[PDB]
Structure 1
Amino acid sequence: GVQTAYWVQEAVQPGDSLADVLARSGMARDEIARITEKYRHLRADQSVHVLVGGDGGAREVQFFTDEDGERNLVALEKKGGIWRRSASEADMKVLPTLRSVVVKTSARGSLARAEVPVEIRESLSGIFAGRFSLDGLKEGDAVRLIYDSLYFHGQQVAAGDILAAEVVKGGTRHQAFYYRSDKGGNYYDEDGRVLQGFNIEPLVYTRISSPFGYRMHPILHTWRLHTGIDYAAPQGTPVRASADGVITFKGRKGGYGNAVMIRHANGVETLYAHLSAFSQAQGNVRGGEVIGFVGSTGRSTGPHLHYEARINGQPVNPVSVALPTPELTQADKAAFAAQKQKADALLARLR
């Protein structure tokens, strides 16, 4: 009898194009065209979804883009015969995720079995990197986490930042709390003291135009993930290394324009882009010496620096990880205490 609509999932293979994946799914030739007419692009490690109507006609197509610098969540619907970027306020919903796990084999291993996003395992590693090694957790060691999770139409699509984390290694308790204020946040321990190389910011900037993490466009309601920090600064402004390490690259790089990377050791790297010019200071960099100057090369509006920290792999909120953490004043102390208590109430849920 009558046919019902169904979803088709097509994974994205190496250096694949949208039209490519869309074609392997079985989508019509002329249909692929009407789509790519308005929409180095397709984020690998995923799969584009296509809703097929009972009549075999495509009605929707959602997927993630991995453009250089940021990733976009593209949702497209077909109405009246035209593909339009679908979006709405109620589409996404962020919830606090309470995950508790006890180490058995390895720390990173057990956390993976507990359904803990790779992003979080690495973000957690850098946060406590100044107290212990996340890989030195023996059996019986606990890891209690609380982090925002993004749900698209009731379906978990990503993971926000860590709100609080309690780790017990060998019986020693280590706590980390996320604190935000003013008109990104930072991580502090239970006593409000700084946790933990990166003793300075990459430069002197006028203001931070765009923070790290997921954010919804105020009017388009679309969602995008900025894989770094946008430091607004006059072009030509000296861009120095945040810490020691060794520069491993430099030159034009996709939408990043001129950029350089530094392997700060311990399995961590950094990247500064959109530079107007370098300064050629390869080899080992003491940490602090100029390595570039602000510009607007690659995919960028005006002058500013793109700071991106990549722990054991890909993008990770550089805050309190690959940047210095400011001390808490009275303009905080009280507020922080109020926030620490809220997170601890959720933590106690995993004890």
Structure 2
Amino acid sequence: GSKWEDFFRGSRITETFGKYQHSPFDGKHYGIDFALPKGTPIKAPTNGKVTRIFNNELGGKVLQIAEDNGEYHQWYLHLDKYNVKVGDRVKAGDIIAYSGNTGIQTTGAHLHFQRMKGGVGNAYAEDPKPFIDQLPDGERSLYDL
């Protein structure tokens, strides 16, 4: 009826690239965290091809993609469902998966996008922010809201 209005505040990002707290014991986040409703399709930011597909006990489901120059990598943690297989070519704006609260103990879902160069792992990560900064629809080149 009359009452429905949103308790909105700020943008959808939980955490960007950097340390969790002061002191050296709470380490670095190597990605970007888009808070999403469960079942939202994740879109390809760039044209590329799938390298690896696997499921982690604490990070949930994981998709790995490679860019067309072959040096840059793209991780996608906290998926409900895949829309591609290993060895599929993709094109920017195409659905590659759907995000869901997999790995997460109680909290709502967030797409963890992790951007890497020369290989894949924490040390290979660069920064996702300046990459999204040039995309056709920005962060909406990665999700369907």
Common fold: TM-score over 0.5: yes
SS in 2 for 1:302: coil
After superposition, residues 1-351 of structure 1 pair within 5 angstroms as 207-216=12-21, 223-266=26-69, 267-280=71-84, 282=86, 283-299=88-104, 301-313=107-119, 314-321=124-131, 323-325=132-134
Deviations 1:92-151 (A, max 9, x none): xxxxxxxxxxxxxxxxxxxxxxxxxxxxxxxxxxxxxxxxxxxxxxxxxxxxxxxxxxxx
Letter in 2 for 1:249: R
CA distance in 2, matches of 1:312, 1:256: 22
Deviations 1:203-254 (A, max 9, x none): xxx610111112425xx99532111111101111110111111011223134
- Tell me, yes or no, if the aligned pair for 2:17 and 2:30 is still in contact at 8 Å: yes
Q: State how many pairs are aligned.
A: 119
Unpaired runs of 5+ in structure 1?
Answer: 1-182, 184-205, 327-351
Flag structure 2 segments of 5+ consecutive residues without an equivalent. Answer: 1-9, 136-145
CA contact (8 A) 2:16 2:32 kept: yes
Structure 2: how far apart are the matches of 1:240 and 1:223?
A: 31
TM-score computed with the length of structure 2 as normaliser: 0.70
Q: Is the 8 A contact 2:78 2:103 kept in 1?
A: yes
TM-score (norm 1): 0.31
Conserved 8 A contact 2:115-2:127: yes
Query: 1:209·1:232 contact (CA, 8 Å) conserved in 2?
Result: yes
Structure scoring higher RCO (CA < 8 A, sep ≥ 6) equals 2
Q: Deviations over 1:65-109 (max 9, x none)?
A: xxxxxxxxxxxxxxxxxxxxxxxxxxxxxxxxxxxxxxxxxxxxx
What root-mean-square deviation, in Å, do the aligned CA atoms of Structure 1 and Structure 2 show? Answer: 2.5
Where do 4+ consecutive residues of structure 1 move more than 6 Å?
none
